[PDB]
Design an enzyme around this catalytic site. Structure first.
Site, PDB file in Angstrom:
ATOM      1  N   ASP A   1      99.530  -4.488 -36.512  1.00  0.00           N
ATOM      2  CA  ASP A   1      98.417  -3.615 -36.864  1.00  0.00           C
ATOM      3  C   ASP A   1      97.491  -4.290 -37.907  1.00  0.00           C
ATOM      4  O   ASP A   1      97.851  -4.366 -39.091  1.00  0.00           O
ATOM      5  CB  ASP A   1      99.012  -2.290 -37.387  1.00  0.00           C
ATOM      6  CG  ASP A   1      98.051  -1.152 -37.590  1.00  0.00           C
ATOM      7  OD1 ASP A   1      96.928  -1.401 -38.075  1.00  0.00           O
ATOM      8  OD2 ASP A   1      98.428  -0.010 -37.295  1.00  0.00           O
TER       9      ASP A   1
ATOM     10  N   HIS B   1      97.653   6.816 -36.282  1.00  0.00           N
ATOM     11  CA  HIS B   1      98.025   7.857 -37.249  1.00  0.00           C
ATOM     12  C   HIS B   1      98.678   9.091 -36.661  1.00  0.00           C
ATOM     13  O   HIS B   1      99.435   9.743 -37.377  1.00  0.00           O
ATOM     14  CB  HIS B   1      96.822   8.311 -38.082  1.00  0.00           C
ATOM     15  CG  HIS B   1      96.238   7.264 -38.946  1.00  0.00           C
ATOM     16  ND1 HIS B   1      97.031   6.508 -39.816  1.00  0.00           N
ATOM     17  CD2 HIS B   1      94.951   6.888 -39.079  1.00  0.00           C
ATOM     18  CE1 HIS B   1      96.195   5.704 -40.445  1.00  0.00           C
ATOM     19  NE2 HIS B   1      94.933   5.892 -40.031  1.00  0.00           N
TER      20      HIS B   1
HETATM   21  C1  LIG Z   1      90.408  10.063 -45.813  1.00  0.00           C
HETATM   22  C2  LIG Z   1      90.365   9.835 -44.285  1.00  0.00           C
HETATM   23  C3  LIG Z   1      90.478   8.313 -43.884  1.00  0.00           C
HETATM   24  C4  LIG Z   1      90.576   8.194 -42.340  1.00  0.00           C
HETATM   25  C5  LIG Z   1      90.726   6.757 -41.876  1.00  0.00           C
HETATM   26  C6  LIG Z   1      91.213   6.766 -40.427  1.00  0.00           C
HETATM   27  C7  LIG Z   1      91.249   5.374 -39.873  1.00  0.00           C
HETATM   28  O1  LIG Z   1      90.329   4.573 -39.883  1.00  0.00           O
HETATM   29  N1  LIG Z   1      92.493   5.007 -39.293  1.00  0.00           N
HETATM   30  O2  LIG Z   1      92.701   3.680 -39.228  1.00  0.00           O
HETATM   31  N2  LIG Z   1      89.126  10.459 -43.717  1.00  0.00           N
HETATM   32  C8  LIG Z   1      87.845  10.161 -44.094  1.00  0.00           C
HETATM   33  C9  LIG Z   1      86.635  10.739 -43.813  1.00  0.00           C
HETATM   34  N3  LIG Z   1      86.372  11.873 -43.094  1.00  0.00           N
HETATM   35  C10 LIG Z   1      85.164  12.517 -42.871  1.00  0.00           C
HETATM   36  C11 LIG Z   1      85.234  13.542 -41.901  1.00  0.00           C
HETATM   37  C12 LIG Z   1      84.079  14.142 -41.468  1.00  0.00           C
HETATM   38  C13 LIG Z   1      82.848  13.741 -42.031  1.00  0.00           C
HETATM   39  O3  LIG Z   1      81.642  14.277 -41.658  1.00  0.00           O
HETATM   40  C14 LIG Z   1      81.398  15.633 -41.873  1.00  0.00           C
HETATM   41  F1  LIG Z   1      82.161  16.380 -41.060  1.00  0.00           F
HETATM   42  F2  LIG Z   1      81.751  15.878 -43.145  1.00  0.00           F
HETATM   43  F3  LIG Z   1      80.122  16.005 -41.672  1.00  0.00           F
HETATM   44  C15 LIG Z   1      82.737  12.752 -43.019  1.00  0.00           C
HETATM   45  C16 LIG Z   1      83.912  12.129 -43.442  1.00  0.00           C
HETATM   46  C17 LIG Z   1      85.847   9.691 -44.512  1.00  0.00           C
HETATM   47  O4  LIG Z   1      84.710   9.380 -44.689  1.00  0.00           O
HETATM   48  C18 LIG Z   1      87.178   9.047 -44.852  1.00  0.00           C
HETATM   49  O5  LIG Z   1      87.553   8.123 -45.441  1.00  0.00           O
HETATM   50 CA   LIG Z   2      96.949  -2.019 -40.669  1.00  0.00          CA
HETATM   51 ZN   LIG Z   3      91.508   2.475 -40.063  1.00  0.00          ZN
END
Ligand SMILES: C[C@H](CCCCC(=O)NO)Nc1c(Nc2ccc(OC(F)(F)F)cc2)c(=O)c1=O
Ligand SMILES: [Ca+2]
Ligand SMILES: [Zn+2]
Ligand code: NA
Length: 369
Positions: free
Chosen positions: A169, A136
């Site tokens: 990917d 990403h």
């Molecule tokens: C939408 C974005 C998707 C990321 C995918 C990246 C990947 O696999 N690439 O292939 N982010 C997200 C979260 N983020 C999140 C961040 C911090 C967190 O913990 C906290 F800080 F809130 F305590 C909890 C969830 C989720 O939970 C979740 O979904």
């Molecule tokens: Ca993929």
């Molecule tokens: Zn992913």
């Protein structure tokens, strides 16, 4: 044919980097993988290297100087002073500031670039970096837990010796960072299979096929919730075979994001470790220099199972289902088996949808000279 030389990259410190309380990205899963495959005795069949810490000189081959200088400076104790820079670079929330952030980026990138160097030197057939695959990250931005795009940097290294590099990917999310970097070039073909429709990052439509010199060199397979091993395998082998026949690359980069597995905390797919690893077996059959990388995966016991089995597959090594004792043995309860079972979730991807998308991609692949 037969068995091949495999070089694996791992740094003993990687598992100590912490994104913060409640954050789903857990670098410890890389240590769990390493410990699990050492206990299977897979270290006997492969060369284990410690990655170098990639430098700013290496990172700025793709990333802006301004973004890399920020990553190399930001600390949890100086965040207030970098407030503007944090919002501009998407740092502080999804991509949090944490102790040793830059080091973590250096080790993750280091293994990928070192793997590419080893493949370029013809000193190995396959290179593995489970800490890599951070698809990403953008020229000047962090996104989806990715700060430095190690894949783009490793692909740029492969381009020194390889006229055509193929990127695959199998993470549940679209590899938008890699696709963006090589969108206008035919020297890199990007192939991504991902969940699409009101899902992160929101890119990777069937109609996103590249631009200019790169038109028809970006391949996207958008999918719905609950895809199983049978539906996935039926489209993966024919798409990759047609890509290999039409594009004829001299090197391959396979991003093995384990968030496409059944039971993943952030994923909606229903693949087993066997179904996910069949993608490695397919790509390996083409006998091209191969760089295998990590990515997402948030049910860390299944990430450790997945990547251990995918290393064993790279080595053509049969490993028993009964897990050996290891430092994270309790994580693999209640069964303590290597392989996983799919859930009862509905597969929203019908066989007709799978066939129709495959046919649409086949029409685009025929446009290649
Ligand atoms: C939408 C974005 C998707 C990321 C995918 C990246 C990947 O696999 N690439 O292939 N982010 C997200 C979260 N983020 C999140 C961040 C911090 C967190 O913990 C906290 F800080 F809130 F305590 C909890 C969830 C989720 O939970 C979740 O979904
Ligand atoms: Ca993929
Ligand atoms: Zn992913
Ligand atoms: Na391209």
């Amino acid at each position: 044919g037969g068995k091949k030389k495999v070089c694996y990259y791992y740094d003993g410190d990687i598992g100590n980097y912490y994104y913060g309380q409640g954050h789903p990205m857990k670098p410890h899963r890389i240590r769990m993988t390493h410990n699990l495959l050492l206990n299977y005795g897979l270290y006997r069949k492969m060369e284990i290297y410690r990655p170098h810490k990639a430098t700013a000189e290496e990172m700025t081959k793709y990333h802006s100087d301004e973004y890399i200088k920020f990553l190399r400076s930001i600390r949890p104790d100086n965040m207030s002073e970098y407030s503007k820079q944090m919002q501009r670079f998407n740092v502080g929330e999804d991509c949090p500031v944490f102790d040793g952030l830059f080091e973590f980026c250096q080790l993750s990138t280091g293994g990928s670039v070192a793997g590419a160097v080893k493949l370029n030197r013809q000193q190995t057939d396959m290179a593995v970096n489970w800490a890599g695959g951070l698809h990403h990250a953008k020229k000047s931005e962090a996104s989806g837990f990715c700060y430095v795009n190690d894949i783009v940097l490793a692909i740029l290294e492969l381009l020194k010796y390889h006229q055509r590099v193929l990127y695959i990917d199998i993470d549940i999310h679209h590899g938008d960072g890699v696709e963006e970097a090589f969108y206008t070039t035919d020297r890199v073909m990007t192939v991504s299979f991902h969940k699409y429709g009101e899902y992160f990052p929101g890119t990777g439509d069937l109609r996103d096929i590249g631009a200019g010199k790169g038109k028809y060199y970006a391949v996207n397979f958008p999918m719905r919730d609950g895809i199983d091993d049978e539906s996935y395998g039926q489209i993966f082998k024919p798409i990759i075979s047609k890509v290999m026949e039409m594009y004829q690359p001299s090197a391959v980069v396979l991003q093995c994001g384990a968030d496409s597995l059944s039971g993943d905390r952030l994923g909606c797919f229903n693949l087993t470790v066997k179904g996910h690893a069949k993608c490695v077996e397919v790509v390996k059959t083409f006998n091209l220099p191969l760089l295998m990388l990590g990515g997402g995966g948030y049910t860390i016991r299944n990430v450790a199972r997945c990547w251990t089995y995918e290393t064993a597959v790279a080595l053509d090594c049969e490993i028993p289902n009964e897990l050996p004792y290891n430092d994270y043995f309790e994580y693999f309860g209640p069964d303590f088996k290597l392989h996983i079972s799919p859930s009862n979730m509905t597969n929203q991807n019908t066989p007709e949808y799978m066939e129709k998308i495959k046919q649409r991609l086949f029409e685009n692949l025929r446009m290649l000279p």
